[PDB]
Amino acid sequence: DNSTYRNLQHHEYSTYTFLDLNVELSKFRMPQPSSGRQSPRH
Amino acid sequence: NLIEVFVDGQSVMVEPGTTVLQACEKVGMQIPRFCYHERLSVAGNCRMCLVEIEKAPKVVAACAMPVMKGWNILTNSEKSKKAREGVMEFLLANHPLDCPICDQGGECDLQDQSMMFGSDRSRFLEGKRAVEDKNIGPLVKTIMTRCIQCTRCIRFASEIAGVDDLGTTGRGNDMQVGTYIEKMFMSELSGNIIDICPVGALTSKPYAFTARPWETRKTESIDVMDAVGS
Amino acid sequence: TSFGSLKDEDRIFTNLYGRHDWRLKGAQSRGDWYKTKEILLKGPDWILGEVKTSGLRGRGGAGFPTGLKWSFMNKPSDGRPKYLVVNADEGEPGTCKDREIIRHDPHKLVEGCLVGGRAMGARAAYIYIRGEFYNEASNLQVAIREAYEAGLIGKNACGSGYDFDVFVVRGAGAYICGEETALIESIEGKQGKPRLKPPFPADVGVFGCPTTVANVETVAVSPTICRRGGAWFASFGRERNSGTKLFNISGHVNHPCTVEEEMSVPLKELIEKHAGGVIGGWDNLLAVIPGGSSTPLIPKSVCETVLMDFDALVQAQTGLGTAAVIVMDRSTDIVKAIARLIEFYKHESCGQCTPCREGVDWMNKVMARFVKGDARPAEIDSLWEISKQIEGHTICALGDGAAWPVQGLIRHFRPELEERMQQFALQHQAR
Amino acid sequence: GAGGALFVHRDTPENNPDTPFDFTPENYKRIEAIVKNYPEGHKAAAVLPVLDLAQRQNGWLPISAMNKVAEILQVPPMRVYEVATFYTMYNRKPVGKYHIQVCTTTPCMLRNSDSILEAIQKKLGIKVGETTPDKLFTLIEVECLGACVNAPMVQINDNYYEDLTPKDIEEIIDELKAGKIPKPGPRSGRFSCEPAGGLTSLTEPPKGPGFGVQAGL
Amino acid sequence: WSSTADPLSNLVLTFSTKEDAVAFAEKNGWSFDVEERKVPKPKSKSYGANFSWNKRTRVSTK
Amino acid sequence: RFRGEHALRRYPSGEERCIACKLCEAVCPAQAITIEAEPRADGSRRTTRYDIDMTKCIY
Ligand SMILES: Cc1cc2nc3c(=O)[nH]c(=O)nc-3n(C[C@H](O)[C@H](O)[C@H](O)COP(=O)(O)O)c2cc1C
Ligand code: SF4
Numbered sequence A: 001d002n003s004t005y006r007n008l009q010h011h012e013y014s015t016y017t018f019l020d021l022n023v024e025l026s027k028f029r030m031p032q033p034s035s036g037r038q039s040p041r042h
Numbered sequence B: 001n002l003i004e005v006f007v008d009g010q011s012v013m014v015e016p017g018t019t020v021l022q023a024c025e026k027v028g029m030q031i032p033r034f035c036y037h038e039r040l041s042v043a044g045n046c047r048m049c050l051v052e053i054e055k056a057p058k059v060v061a062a063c064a065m066p067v068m069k070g071w072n073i074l075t076n077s078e079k080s081k082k083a084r085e086g087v088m089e090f091l092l093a094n095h096p097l098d099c100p101i102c103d104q105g106g107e108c109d110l111q112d113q114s115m116m117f118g119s120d121r122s123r124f125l126e127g128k129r130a131v132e133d134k135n136i137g138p139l140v141k142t143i144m145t146r147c148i149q150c151t152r153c154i155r156f157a158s159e160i161a162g163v164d165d166l167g168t169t170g171r172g173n174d175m176q177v178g179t180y181i182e183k184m185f186m187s188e189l190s191g192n193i194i195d196i197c198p199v200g201a202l203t204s205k206p207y208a209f210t211a212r213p214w215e216t217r218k219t220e221s222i223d224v225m226d227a228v229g230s
Numbered sequence C: 001t002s003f004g005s006l007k008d009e010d011r012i013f014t015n016l017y018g019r020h021d022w023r024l025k026g027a028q029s030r031g032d033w034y035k036t037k038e039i040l041l042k043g044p045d046w047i048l049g050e051v052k053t054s055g056l057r058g059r060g061g062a063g064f065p066t067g068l069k070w071s072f073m074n075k076p077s078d079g080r081p082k083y084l085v086v087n088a089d090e091g092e093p094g095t096c097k098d099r100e101i102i103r104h105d106p107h108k109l110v111e112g113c114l115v116g117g118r119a120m121g122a123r124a125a126y127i128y129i130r131g132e133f134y135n136e137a138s139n140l141q142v143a144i145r146e147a148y149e150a151g152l153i154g155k156n157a158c159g160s161g162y163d164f165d166v167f168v169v170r171g172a173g174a175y176i177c178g179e180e181t182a183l184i185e186s187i188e189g190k191q192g193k194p195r196l197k198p199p200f201p202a203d204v205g206v207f208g209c210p211t212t213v214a215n216v217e218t219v220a221v222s223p224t225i226c227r228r229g230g231a232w233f234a235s236f237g238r239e240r241n242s243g244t245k246l247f248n249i250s251g252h253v254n255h256p257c258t259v260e261e262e263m264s265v266p267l268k269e270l271i272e273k274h275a276g277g278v279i280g281g282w283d284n285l286l287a288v289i290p291g292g293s294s295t296p297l298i299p300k301s302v303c304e305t306v307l308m309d310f311d312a313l314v315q316a317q318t319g320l321g322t323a324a325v326i327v328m329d330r331s332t333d334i335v336k337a338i339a340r341l342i343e344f345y346k347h348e349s350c351g352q353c354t355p356c357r358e359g360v361d362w363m364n365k366v367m368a369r370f371v372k373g374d375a376r377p378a379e380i381d382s383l384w385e386i387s388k389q390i391e392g393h394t395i396c397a398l399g400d401g402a403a404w405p406v407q408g409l410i411r412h413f414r415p416e417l418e419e420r421m422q423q424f425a426l427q428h429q430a431r
Numbered sequence D: 001g002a003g004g005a006l007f008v009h010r011d012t013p014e015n016n017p018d019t020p021f022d023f024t025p026e027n028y029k030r031i032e033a034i035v036k037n038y039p040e041g042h043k044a045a046a047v048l049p050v051l052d053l054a055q056r057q058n059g060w061l062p063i064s065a066m067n068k069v070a071e072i073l074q075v076p077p078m079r080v081y082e083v084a085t086f087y088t089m090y091n092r093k094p095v096g097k098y099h100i101q102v103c104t105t106t107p108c109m110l111r112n113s114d115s116i117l118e119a120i121q122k123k124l125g126i127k128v129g130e131t132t133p134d135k136l137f138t139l140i141e142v143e144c145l146g147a148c149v150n151a152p153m154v155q156i157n158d159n160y161y162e163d164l165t166p167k168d169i170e171e172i173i174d175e176l177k178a179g180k181i182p183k184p185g186p187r188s189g190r191f192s193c194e195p196a197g198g199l200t201s202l203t204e205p206p207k208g209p210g211f212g213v214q215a216g217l
Numbered sequence E: 001w002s003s004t005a006d007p008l009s010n011l012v013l014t015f016s017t018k019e020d021a022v023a024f025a026e027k028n029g030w031s032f033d034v035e036e037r038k039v040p041k042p043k044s045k046s047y048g049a050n051f052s053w054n055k056r057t058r059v060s061t062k
Numbered sequence F: 001r002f003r004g005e006h007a008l009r010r011y012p013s014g015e016e017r018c019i020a021c022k023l024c025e026a027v028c029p030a031q032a033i034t035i036e037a038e039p040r041a042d043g044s045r046r047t048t049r050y051d052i053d054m055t056k057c058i059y
């Protein structure tokens, strides 16, 4: 079957869909590196 | 150790990391500049310091280009002269005709470099832009139509005065230097933005319209208002 | 040898047009996430050798050797993180290939990011996608979440003992932030203006760390090149112009579309085979822009026998860049089209540096006068000279790309401009 | 040409530094998640995502929202203003409920996007850059939106409507003002960038895993 | 108007070297004070310093 | 083209044309022009002193 469009998942996307997934991925992230200072102006 | 470069065929030994502009300074040549200040960070946006390397096909910005070993710097080359003429043509194409009513008249780096490394004619047949003037305090008078967007005041503000209130708002030809909000740029070192501005965009308000540089006599003395002895 | 008539068994971007499942199950049904652990265990030098032998060139503009760039970033570590930055700021007019790839092959994109990060020794990969592609970004996030859950990325990626992170950064509308250095600046939360070079992103990149900016198509074809062998990829296409390319044919054509083809298919064959040909027939063709708006246009005579590769298009005084064919037939105002392109470049200029800022505004005004004939024949040479002054004197390549269409229009349609000026001058006397 | 936008701020009762704005707890959790995506000491890299989140919460970006973002990220308000004024996807003044953006670049211009623009203008009775009296639609012209083969096209609040005709866009506007939500995508019988006449490629089943895998790999 | 009574008010002489200037002053008999030349010292400038991973020289704007 | 007694003109609106630029003083061969300026009450760049010594001018 090659006559149907399978990308219909994007028809139900709220305004926070992109950020909601980003919250879910925060558990799988590796620890971030540190530059040794809190900010360039510290 | 020191590397060897060539300026107009003359050999000169410079430290690693030295720029083309500083090598020219070593050999005695002053490359034209608008955005470069030796006490500020490098910007490389005014494009007035474009010089030609002997065999390179593209000109480089002397203010931000470290010298390589064996490079020959052609300061007075045809490509360099044409590049300077083009950059000056753009700057003066968008600049306003305010020289007689401008406090920067006889001491303007735009006028002097236009008369030295620029063309004597204009082929700009369109209309110029106009920018609303800002207000940043009683010490600095701003006529932002004369600004060439060289970002000297922003870099000076940030690095020297530690005050991050100046910046560029907008994009393209409509980019404007200012505080966005009506905050006044007040500091103990706020007249130095008047000093470092190459154009009359920032000028001394108390000194406005009083005199011209060619009339004044300069006496070298020291400052007596504190113990620094400036 | 003739190039074209690409076979589906050799096409890389399967599931284009989105006719199959784009999720993890559908991707694994096709050739995705296959022997990725074996590739990672083979390691950086082998992957770089495969890429260099395949001879892949940059698909997002200037065609620099991707193997050479990745070898440049393959230097030993010095105490700083390493990043692969994938450019999905598809702001070039006429181009949709990155959008289609992200929307229909996100697992292929993620696997390519992982392979490139392993090749470069990079700990992280930031996919900077333009903000207008919200649904594409959401699909990419869903695919990344599926990969994380399946263990294909993250800690111990593919069970190879290699830790690799993948992030997605949505950037607001900035065609200039599409550029690599401006993209690096925009990731850092800054205004988004390009840096000077040197320093190069290999030495000083995002956050001051070694980064490599690569195109979506390049990173997406990287794992397929590693799997199939690279020699096959080099075999497809011409010499030094090899591989498969996505062409976006649009404009005055019967069936505008995006299609994968060989690297040296002739332009006329591509248009007449995968796009239905020019509306009203091929003889009704006026001009074709081979790449994006940055590339110069060519007339029908040049388009009659031109090939769609870097060197062949360079010989035609134009470039390839992002392969995006724009077709204009004889029933259009070529001057108005070029003026609209120059207006686009005026709006998208970042305004940092004087040549592009001032000169692009000036050329926009000059073209706006040209479209109505309110000019003189002596101003064409002035426009040519100012375009030449802009080119090569700017910080980044947007200034160069803003002058090439003007140069092409002056070079191939000067009689049109002069006729328009004469008509305006005659109509002025009519009062 | 001129875009008719001012890059200076004049305080008004509707938009002043004392305008009430603060992130909801869910938005604060989202911000905390966003910040952890960058190395420690470089949290200024989140200015664009946090500003976008503020705009998605508030509809637009007031000066109070910019100041709140600056306070949260410990970055200068001048830097926040620079970002907001540089990037065009940030609405510095209130817009309508639906932001219609018609692409007017050359590839869309060749396929008569002016007809779409005029159909929208006549249907809503507004000019480009103006907002309807009920504050429901805001019509603007934009550059290339990334879907050029599906021209002409418009973007309405992160949704692409492609292969449009005047009747199609009028139907879209009717559905929008009727409280419904039109289905995004091409409206000319197509589903994606494939040729309208048919599939000129990829007409065979895709190969399985390891189709052309080399000896070593 | 600005009146004066000093004939040497507008008199400025140009010399190539401090030694020549001092010799001229000594042979003309006027009292003199000499100030040493203040050249600007060389400085280290790097455009890559504006984008630093862990230093304070990183700029917040361009 | 005859050169005689000097005069300062005005605009048709009545505002004086001089903007206190001192090109007069810069270019005068005989240094017969003395100009002193300060911002006017409305902020205009206008002269407060403009003297010409007709016994020093060479016309
Ligand atoms: C989607 C996209 C948009 C780009 N936009 C620009 C642009 O506006 N200006 C520019 O000078 N280069 C632009 N480039 C090219 C980049 O400077 C850089 O060459 C590219 O991102 C990485 O090179 P590659 O093709 O080898 O991967 C763009 C590249 C891509 C992929
Ligand atoms: S800043 Fe310089 S060029 Fe501009 S009006 Fe003043 S004197 Fe003339």
Ligand code: SF4
Pocket (backbone or CB within 6 Å): B146, B147, B148, B149, B150, B151, B152, B153, B154, B177, B196, B197, B198, B199, B201, B202
């Ligand atoms: S106001 Fe002066 S110092 Fe500041 S960017 Fe403009 S020209 Fe440069």
Ligand code: SF4
Pocket (backbone or CB within 6 Å): C176, C193, C194, C348, C349, C350, C351, C352, C353, C354, C356, C357, C394, C395, C396, C397, C398, C399, C400
């Ligand atoms: S060429 Fe234009 S877009 Fe590029 S840095 Fe200069 S002003 Fe910015």
Ligand code: SF4
Pocket (backbone or CB within 6 Å): F017, F018, F019, F020, F021, F022, F023, F024, F025, F035
């Ligand atoms: S000072 Fe300047 S403006 Fe006034 S009269 Fe003389 S030349 Fe004219």
Ligand code: FES
Pocket (backbone or CB within 6 Å): B032, B033, B034, B035, B036, B043, B044, B045, B046, B047, B048, B049, B050, B061, B062, B063, B064
């Ligand atoms: S002085 Fe070098 S670009 Fe300005």
Ligand code: FES
Pocket (backbone or CB within 6 Å): C093, C094, C095, D103, D104, D105, D106, D107, D108, D143, D144, D145, D146, D147, D148, D151, D153
């Ligand atoms: S030209 Fe309109 S979407 Fe690209």
Ligand SMILES: [Mg+2]
Pocket (backbone or CB within 6 Å): B104, B194, B195, B196, B197, B198, B199, B200, B201, B202, B203
């Ligand atoms: Mg000044």
